[PDB]
Design a binder for this molecule. Sequence first.
Ligand SMILES: *C/C=C(C)/C=C/C=C(C)/C=C/C1=C(C)CCCC1(C)C
Length: 137
Amino acid sequence: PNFSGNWKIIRSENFEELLKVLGVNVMLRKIWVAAASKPAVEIKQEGDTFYIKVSTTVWTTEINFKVGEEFEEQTVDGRPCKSLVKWESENKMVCEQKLLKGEGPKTSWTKELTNDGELILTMTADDVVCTQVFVRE
Ligand SMILES: *C/C=C(C)/C=C/C=C(C)/C=C/C1=C(C)CCCC1(C)C
């Protein structure tokens, strides 16, 4: 299908509980939530190759990967990891992450397209699941 587009967020669930699990402490969480949980996402897709830009007001992250091809990126909390993306359906990809150094919670994210226009992100830390919902620009 086509994940390609400029996405803006309409819903966000359990983002604070995600950071709590990740170890961010209370004060930092509250701010992070309030300032930096209206992010912009841009995706350009060339088949099974992905460019992904996620940006706050003063921060940007650029992710590049081919599906099935192991790459390096960051956990939600800024820690470096090895990632691998696989398909689970036509409109849904899944990514597992292994830390580069450290022990830490088990992290992953998924990404799905509805047919009703929605782009759905999940990020997972152990048994907590943050769900963010986007529609197009
Ligand atoms: C396919 C979609 C992907 C890979 C989206 C990833 C989104 C993130 C890794 C979001 C990360 C965030 C931070 C690292 C801090 C600011 C808050 C978020 C949720 C925008």
